[PDB]
């Protein structure tokens, strides 16, 4: 079939098994970004019921639900393979599930190269970091905000509890 | 509505139905079938996909075939025009004589007689097999379950019953050969032809055959029963006719069902046995009665699963029985044709009121002795030829006489048994044993009682040597 | 399904809907593969139970028509293939080569040589997917049919077309016995009554090549192979093959049956077949059942066996006598399918090793062995002597009854026991001992008429061989006659007697 | 092609190959596991992921790790240099004396040799030990399964056979210590070493040892089976040899298969099994044969779980055999070694023909008497005696003598027995029992018959046992 292509984040697949399709698909043809933005759009373009809530209503025939929810509307400019994957998640009911694919996705060309370490408070904040260099400190300085006792606490950040924890 | 073959995984067919799922039990007719390919809609999976069941032949089926719903269950011919005719489940001949020319059609289901619809009549009918009358009374509408050794006794017996009855009782019979062995039906056929009670020149057979054979899908095998029921309901209700409904094998039904539950994805009850086993039955037995118009007395072959009864399936069955004939293989082995397990060729029914009070009593004497006799037998396995503490021997022997006397040679088994027919008219029977209780058979030795009709003939036979 | 093609690669193009567009319909790409189960994506349009054809050449079959893919039991390797492999439809389910040139041939279950006699010719091919005949299409069994084993032919008097279970244990010579029967059919094939020519189909079900090899060698030795198919599903087999083999066999024998011919299929054994199938189902996660067995394997078989028949001549002219074998393991028929099967045939043949251990081949538990049939499956001949014998063994057994209680209780019976013992001697029947009836009855007659009660039990046998040679030589006339009479005639008896007496006299003295 | 281990759920190693999957069965070398971690492709799981199997174990693996296909299935050293060596699957020196330097390499796969290419009907390999040959004569090149609860002197017994026989045998032998106690193998090794048959001076011996011990991770145990096969095949055909193939224990093998079956994401089976057991075996056992090119008489030790034979696996097993040695736990339990249930240890291969009728018959009478004799045994056991038949008494006793006469102590293992009691060349065997059949002996002892050899001497012992 194809061969594996996965933008930085990348993901685990699974409700992103699609994501990963487009982590190879979008990626390939490199409308990576076209769709990258599409998705974003879609998100709220999505979010309101209609011909969408349609699905919920079991009794609405998926067959034509696709031809309504996506016929006139989700092809409003969401199409390339994008309507087709719409129409796939559509079939495959992964529509209510779609946000998460975006989530998953969206850490993708930017956030694709995110920022991770699990770090007190509003922790990391997916950005970008280059592991050879420190990037850490910098960030911290920037702010003298967050909440750190309520938000992540002196127990992590510096063991308030630990002294308790030995006994 | 229309369906699409979307997946066939064995006879579990998912049809995605392209339109409105109507009620279940709708027979769907597969289009693209040069057969009468009925699917019974089984589950509305939703988004018009049904799980349906194939009952008809396969291997070739397009994933994409076209199904057109008959929108109802099957309608199949019902009415008297079935007599003679060997119809399959689909009401279609398999008499191979062409048409089964009822022009009334039916959904193979039928309803369950209300409380009022009990025209259930509490009393013995008879057809002369000694043992029966004696132990297990007959019922009008009743389900009698016949257990045992097919084609060596159980079936054999059935055939004799069939043989005496259809003729003798007017009010017909239906035979539903559920997973019937074509071969046995072949044989049977030839017997039937022979017997001519399958009237064909005048399809005025005293029997209708409905077959849902071995070489057919479980679905197919399962349903012939309902069908048969529908038909018989015609004869009872419509034709008054007091059907004997011969079922061989409800067990084969059971099997068909059981596999099916699984295949239906579904959970089956104990031991794998379909959980609805009972309901299938239950409802079905409830689709029986003696109506006002007629009686459907059911005569039921039950492949006594593993010859076990404890066995939940027969365990269930029992609730629905009105008589049970449980053969005793020991008895069959003991020759005895009839091959009874008399203690379990039983009917909850029988009472000195219900039967002769004498009858009852005589029977009670018998039941008694036999119960006891066993006890002694136990000593004998470890302690005799034909000698112990003789009074006690006497009872044993008598029990043997009784035993022997229960053996009733059977004409249909001049071939099988090697022995010709005997039918013992009832008094001659009661008298026979009653006399044994009266014990004059001392003067008359025992053994000759083995396989005779009325008790005398054994006497004749003994004497000629003594 | 719910993951695959929801995930990339597969999915990754379906999106576009560009990926042959899709096709894989008369093609498939192996969706996933492992282990002889090619989930094959596509093939979409498919027949049911289509045999499909592989990019590894090979076959597999699309039984499971899933909406996405095809559960394909691949009847073999996985070391060929690696995924995505192209499967091309054949548009076609299996039918199998059938013909009469398979008589004289050992093929694999493919109906292809393994015989190493080069290839067979395939005349016909014929559906395995072919149903059982009808009522009238059958005329029931009339024939007798001799295995050349008195006990067998007597106590299960077999005709042809007959479905009947052979059941008995592990290489217990049972199969030897089965062979001997087969050997017996030779004489008929060397005879010329077609109706007595029984074409043998030995379906070797999962039975290892080595095991076949001697055996076949034996068949070779009997040369009888010439009218014999050996349909070969040895142990090595891919399961669908082993599995397949009976149905295959089924097409060919019905053919014969329908070609007037009386065919005999020895299925040895379906116990194994079933394993293979079950295994197959289960692997498809088409789950197990009672005894791990999923249950319409019975339907499979019931139907399979429904395909064995004795045709009304107007309707076939012949027979396919089915002698299925289930080889019991510890005589076990608690064994689900045996329980079932018990419910299926028109008797079943019980073997008792103990007799065997006693030396006595055959093993038989006669008491349990049955041809309900019996007589439809017989002739006048046997009955005249045999009836009594059966009964008398009943008596013998009866005093074995009273060996569940005792050792002596009657003088008569001290005799009867003697008689019984005599009857036993005859029932010792060598393996590799195919007979004609006249012999069988012959040998029965003296003793069952008492005149062998008059001899050392061990020597009965001795007599018998000798006796046989005596008449063979001498009363060849008669042998012609009994054979003529197809029965035991008064004359034959009397003469027999006379002979017997003389022989008897010479042997006894 | 490369994969990275994506899921490790035990030694079921899921490798997602990021590109091309070689067909199933490719032996992969894991890029990282220097703990030479062969993964054998087991499934193509789909989407370039394979299920592969570690033969090995796993601790320390980073979920991530790169795996490089070894590009074939296992290549193993083959040829004679494997004789006198301990090879594992990969033919590594568990001799621990460095490599098993061969020319030849092998896919440890091998398949069933053509049916015609086999020999069709074999000829008896006599089994020496009186009871044994007598009741179970074997075929030269035969597959014998020895059902027996392991370790009951079970194992001892096989060794003893080896002693008698494998010694007596020339050709070559292949020994597979699978799954067995390394400890015993250690001793055995030294014993062979000692024996010098494990030549300490031949890389060869005359015997190659292949081990797939219990303590191993399964794949290793599992696969050593193919390996061993490959070698023996190597010798059989190639070296044209009469190979003896000793397996202890196929049971552990089978078990290994079964164990994985689940993990393999397949269904296990009844009792948990590998449902593919049959195919595995059929194909395997058919890999085994004695063709024309050589003959492998394969003596396959079979631990029979809880001695349940009934137990489907053994039920299957039977097909594969053509000689079964069914050991009676009870007899063994009587200390009586020979311990066999010989009315269960079988060969149809006993013959009036092949084994001549004398033997044969003598046996048939024996089999018989005994077979009857057991039947009562139980009845009488509680049902005591006499208000009976004493001719029976005669048989009982006789049976007992015979019973004892089957017994021969573990000659060599004086450590276990302290006792010797020899091997009985076949005529003497036939004679022995036949003489008992002649029942002359019968006023004599019973343990005279116990744990001995030649009936003459036994008789001698009888007299002697009579003080």
From Swiss-Prot, chain A:
<comment type="subunit">
    <text>Component of the ATP synthase complex composed at least of ATP5F1A/subunit alpha, ATP5F1B/subunit beta, ATP5MC1/subunit c (homooctomer), MT-ATP6/subunit a, MT-ATP8/subunit 8, ATP5ME/subunit e, ATP5MF/subunit f, ATP5MG/subunit g, ATP5MK/subunit k, ATP5MJ/subunit j, ATP5F1C/subunit gamma, ATP5F1D/subunit delta, ATP5F1E/subunit epsilon, ATP5PF/subunit F6, ATP5PB/subunit b, ATP5PD/subunit d, ATP5PO/subunit OSCP.</text>
</comment>
<keyword id="KW-0832">Ubl conjugation</keyword>
<feature type="modified residue" description="N6-acetyllysine; alternate">
    <location>
        <position position="135"/>
    </location>
</feature>
<keyword id="KW-0472">Membrane</keyword>
<feature type="modified residue" description="N6-acetyllysine">
    <location>
        <position position="31"/>
    </location>
</feature>
<keyword id="KW-0066">ATP synthesis</keyword>
<feature type="modified residue" description="N6-succinyllysine; alternate">
    <location>
        <position position="135"/>
    </location>
</feature>
<keyword id="KW-0375">Hydrogen ion transport</keyword>
<feature type="modified residue" description="N6-acetyllysine; alternate">
    <location>
        <position position="77"/>
    </location>
</feature>
<dbReference type="GO" id="GO:0046933">
    <property type="term" value="F:proton-transporting ATP synthase activity, rotational mechanism"/>
</dbReference>
<keyword id="KW-0406">Ion transport</keyword>
<dbReference type="GO" id="GO:0005739">
    <property type="term" value="C:mitochondrion"/>
</dbReference>
<keyword id="KW-0496">Mitochondrion</keyword>
<feature type="modified residue" description="N6-succinyllysine; alternate">
    <location>
        <position position="77"/>
    </location>
</feature>
<keyword id="KW-0809">Transit peptide</keyword>
UniProtKB/Swiss-Prot annotation, chain C:
<dbReference type="Pfam" id="PF02874">
    <property type="entry name" value="ATP-synt_ab_N"/>
</dbReference>
<dbReference type="GO" id="GO:0015986">
    <property type="term" value="P:proton motive force-driven ATP synthesis"/>
</dbReference>
<feature type="modified residue" description="Phosphoserine">
    <location>
        <position position="62"/>
    </location>
</feature>
<dbReference type="InterPro" id="IPR036121">
    <property type="entry name" value="ATPase_F1/V1/A1_a/bsu_N_sf"/>
</dbReference>
<feature type="modified residue" description="N6-succinyllysine; alternate">
    <location>
        <position position="462"/>
    </location>
</feature>
<dbReference type="GO" id="GO:0046933">
    <property type="term" value="F:proton-transporting ATP synthase activity, rotational mechanism"/>
</dbReference>
<feature type="modified residue" description="N6-succinyllysine; alternate">
    <location>
        <position position="217"/>
    </location>
</feature>
<feature type="binding site">
    <location>
        <position position="175"/>
    </location>
    <ligand>
        <name>Mg(2+)</name>
    </ligand>
</feature>
<keyword id="KW-0139">CF(1)</keyword>
<dbReference type="InterPro" id="IPR005294">
    <property type="entry name" value="ATP_synth_F1_asu"/>
</dbReference>
<feature type="modified residue" description="N6-succinyllysine; alternate">
    <location>
        <position position="123"/>
    </location>
</feature>
<feature type="modified residue" description="N6-acetyllysine; alternate">
    <location>
        <position position="462"/>
    </location>
</feature>
<feature type="binding site">
    <location>
        <position position="431"/>
    </location>
    <ligand>
        <name>ATP</name>
    </ligand>
</feature>
<feature type="modified residue" description="N6-succinyllysine; alternate">
    <location>
        <position position="186"/>
    </location>
</feature>
<feature type="modified residue" description="Phosphothreonine">
    <location>
        <position position="90"/>
    </location>
</feature>
UniProtKB/Swiss-Prot annotation, chain D:
<dbReference type="InterPro" id="IPR036121">
    <property type="entry name" value="ATPase_F1/V1/A1_a/bsu_N_sf"/>
</dbReference>
<feature type="binding site">
    <location>
        <position position="152"/>
    </location>
    <ligand>
        <name>phosphate</name>
    </ligand>
</feature>
<feature type="binding site">
    <location>
        <position position="154"/>
    </location>
    <ligand>
        <name>phosphate</name>
    </ligand>
</feature>
<dbReference type="InterPro" id="IPR005722">
    <property type="entry name" value="ATP_synth_F1_bsu"/>
</dbReference>
<dbReference type="InterPro" id="IPR020003">
    <property type="entry name" value="ATPase_a/bsu_AS"/>
</dbReference>
<keyword id="KW-0066">ATP synthesis</keyword>
<feature type="modified residue" description="N6-succinyllysine; alternate">
    <location>
        <position position="103"/>
    </location>
</feature>
<dbReference type="InterPro" id="IPR003593">
    <property type="entry name" value="AAA+_ATPase"/>
</dbReference>
<comment type="function">
    <text>Catalytic subunit beta, of the mitochondrial membrane ATP synthase complex (F(1)F(0) ATP synthase or Complex V) that produces ATP from ADP in the presence of a proton gradient across the membrane which is generated by electron transport complexes of the respiratory chain. ATP synthase complex consist of a soluble F(1) head domain - the catalytic core - and a membrane F(1) domain - the membrane proton channel. These two domains are linked by a central stalk rotating inside the F(1) region and a stationary peripheral stalk.</text>
</comment>
<dbReference type="Pfam" id="PF00006">
    <property type="entry name" value="ATP-synt_ab"/>
</dbReference>
<feature type="binding site">
    <location>
        <position position="156"/>
    </location>
    <ligand>
        <name>ATP</name>
    </ligand>
</feature>
<dbReference type="InterPro" id="IPR004100">
    <property type="entry name" value="ATPase_F1/V1/A1_a/bsu_N"/>
</dbReference>
<dbReference type="GO" id="GO:0016887">
    <property type="term" value="F:ATP hydrolysis activity"/>
</dbReference>
<feature type="modified residue" description="N6-acetyllysine; alternate">
    <location>
        <position position="103"/>
    </location>
</feature>
<feature type="modified residue" description="N6-acetyllysine; alternate">
    <location>
        <position position="66"/>
    </location>
</feature>
């Amino acid at each position: 079939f194809a061969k594996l292509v996965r933008p930085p984040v990348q993901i685990y697949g699974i409700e992103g098994r699609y994501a990963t399709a487009l982590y190879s698909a979008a990626s390939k043809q490199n409308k990576l970004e076209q769709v990258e933005k599409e998705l974003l759009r879609v998100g709220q373009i999505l979010k309101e019921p209609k011909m969408a809530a349609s699905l919920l209503n079991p009794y609405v025939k998926r067959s034509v639900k696709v031809k309504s929810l996506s016929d006139m509307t989700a092809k409003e400019k969401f199409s390339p393979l994008t309507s087709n994957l719409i129409n796939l998640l559509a079939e495959n009911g992964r529509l209510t599930n779609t946000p998460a694919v975006i989530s998953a996705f969206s850490t993708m060309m930017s956030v694709h190269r995110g920022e991770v370490p699990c770090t007190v408070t509003t922790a990391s904040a997916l950005d970008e970091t280059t592991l050879t260099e420190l990037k850490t400190v910098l960030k911290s300085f920037l702010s003298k905000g967050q909440v750190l006792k309520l938000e992540v606490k002196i127990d992590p950040s510096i063991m308030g509890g630990m002294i308790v924890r030995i006994g | 509505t229309t369906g699409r073959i979307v997946a066939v995984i064995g006879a579990v067919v998912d049809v995605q139905f392209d339109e409105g799922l109507p009620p279940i039990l709708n027979a769907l007719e597969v289009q693209g079938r040069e057969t009468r390919l009925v699917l019974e809609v089984a589950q509305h999976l939703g988004e018009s996909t049904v799980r349906t069941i194939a009952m008809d032949g396969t291997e070739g089926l397009v994933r994409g075939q076209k199904v057109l719903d008959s929108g109802a269950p099957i309608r199949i011919p019902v009415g008297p025009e079935t007599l003679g005719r060997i119809m399959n489940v689909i009401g279609e001949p398999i008499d191979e004589r062409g048409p089964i020319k009822t022009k009334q059609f039916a959904a193979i289901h039928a309803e369950a007689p209300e409380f009022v619809e009990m025209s259930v009549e509490q009393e013995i009918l008879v057809t002369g097999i000694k043992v029966v009358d004696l132990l297990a009374p007959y019922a009008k509408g009743g389900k009698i379950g016949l257990f045992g050794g097919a084609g060596v006794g159980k079936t054999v017996l059935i055939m004799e019953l069939i043989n005496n009855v259809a003729k003798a009782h007017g009010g017909y019979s239906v035979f539903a050969g559920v997973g019937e062995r074509t071969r046995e039906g072949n044989d049977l056929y030839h017997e039937m032809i022979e017997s001519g009670v399958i009237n064909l020149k005048d399809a005025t057979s005293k029997v209708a055959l409905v077959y849902g054979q071995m070489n057919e899908p479980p679905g197919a095998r399962a349903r012939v029963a309902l069908t048969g029921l529908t038909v018989a309901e015609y004869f009872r209700d419509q034709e008054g006719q007091d059907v004997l409904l011969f079922i061989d094998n409800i067990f084969r039904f059971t099997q068909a069902g059981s596999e099916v539950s699984a295949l239906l994805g579904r959970i089956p009850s104990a031991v794998g046995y379909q959980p609805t086993l009972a309901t299938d039955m239950g409802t079905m037995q409830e689709r029986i009665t003696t109506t006002k118009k007629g009686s459907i007395t059911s005569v039921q072959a039950i492949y006594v699963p593993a010859d076990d009864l404890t066995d939940p399936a027969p365990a269930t069955t029992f609730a629905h029985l009105d008589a049970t004939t449980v053969l005793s293989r020991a008895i069959a082995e003991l020759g005895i044709y009839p091959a009874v397990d008399p203690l379990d060729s039983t009917s909850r029914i029988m009472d000195p009121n219900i039967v002769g009070s004498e009858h009852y009593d005589v029977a009670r004497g018998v039941q008694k002795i036999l119960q006891d006799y066993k006890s002694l037998q136990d000593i004998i396995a470890i302690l005799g030829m034909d000698e112990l503490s003789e009074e006690d021997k006497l009872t044993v022997s008598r029990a043997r006489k009784i035993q022997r006397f229960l053996s009733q040679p059977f004409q249909v088994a001049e071939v099988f048994t090697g022995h010709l027919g005997k039918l013992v008219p009832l008094k001659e029977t009661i008298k026979g044993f009653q006399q044994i209780l009266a014990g004059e058979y001392d003067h008359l030795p025992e053994q000759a009682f083995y396989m005779v009709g009325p008790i005398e003939e054994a006497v004749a036979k003994a004497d000629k040597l003594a | 399904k719910t993951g695959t093609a929801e995930v990339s690669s597969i999915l990754e193009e379906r999106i576009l809907g560009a990926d042959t567009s899709v096709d894989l319909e008369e093609t498939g790409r192996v969706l996933s593969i492992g282990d002889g189960i090619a989930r094959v994506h596509g093939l979409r349009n498919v027949q049911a139970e289509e045999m499909v054809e592989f990019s590894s050449g090979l076959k597999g079959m699309s039984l499971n028509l899933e909406p996405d893919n095809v559960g394909v039991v691949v009847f073999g390797n996985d070391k060929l293939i690696k995924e995505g492999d192209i499967v091309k439809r054949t548009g076609a389910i299996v039918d199998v080569p059938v013909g009469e040139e398979l008589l004289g041939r050992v093929v694999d279950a493919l109906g292809n040589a393994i015989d190493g006699k080069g290839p067979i010719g395939s005349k016909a091919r014929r559906r395995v997917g072919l149903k059982a005949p009808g009522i009238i299409p059958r005329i029931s069994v009339r024939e007798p049919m001799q295995t050349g084993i008195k006990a067998v032919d007597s106590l299960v008097p077999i005709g042809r077309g007959q479905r009947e279970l052979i059941i008995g244990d592990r290489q217990t010579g049972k199969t030897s016995i089965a062979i001997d029967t087969i050997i017996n059919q030779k004489r008929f094939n060397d005879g010329t009554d077609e109706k007595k020519k029984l074409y043998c189909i030995y379906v070797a079900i999962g039975q290892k090549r080595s095991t076949v090899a001697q055996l076949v060698k034996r068949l070779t030795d009997a040369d009888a192979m010439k009218y014999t198919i050996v349909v070969s599903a040895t142990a090595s087999d891919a399961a669908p093959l082993q599995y397949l083999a009976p149905y295959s066999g089924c097409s060919m024998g019905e053919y014969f049956r329908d070609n007037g011919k009386h065919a005999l299929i020895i299925y040895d054994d379906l116990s194994k077949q079933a394993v293979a199938y079950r295994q197959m189902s289960l692997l498809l996660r088409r789950p197990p059942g009672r005894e791990a067995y999923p249950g319409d394997v019975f339907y499979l078989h019931s139907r399979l066996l429904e395909r064995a028949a004795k045709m009304n001549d107007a309707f076939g002219g012949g027979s396919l006598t089915a002698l299925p074998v289930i080889e019991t393991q510890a005589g076990d028929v608690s064994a689900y399918i045996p329980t079932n099967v018990i419910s299926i045939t028109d008797g079943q043949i019980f073997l008792e090793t103990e007799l065997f251990y006693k030396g006595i081949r055959p093993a038989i538990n006669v008491g349990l062995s049955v041809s309900r049939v019996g007589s439809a499956a017989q002739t006048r001949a046997m009955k005249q002597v045999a009836g009594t014998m059966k009964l008398e063994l009943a008596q013998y057994r009866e005093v074995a009854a009273f060996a569940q209680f005792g050792s002596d209780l009657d003088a008569a019976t001290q005799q009867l026991l003697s008689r019984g013992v005599r009857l036993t001697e005859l029932l010792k029947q060598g393996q590799y001992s195919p007979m004609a009836i006249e012999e069988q009855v012959a040998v029965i007659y003296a003793g069952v008429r008492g005149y062998l009660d008059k001899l050392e039990p061990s020597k009965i046998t001795k007599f018998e061989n000798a006796f046989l040679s005596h008449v063979i030589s001498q009363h060849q006339a008669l042998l012609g006659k009994i054979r003529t009479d197809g029965k035991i005639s008064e004359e034959s008896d009397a003469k027999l007697k006379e002979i017997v007496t003389n022989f008897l006299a010479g042997f006894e003295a």
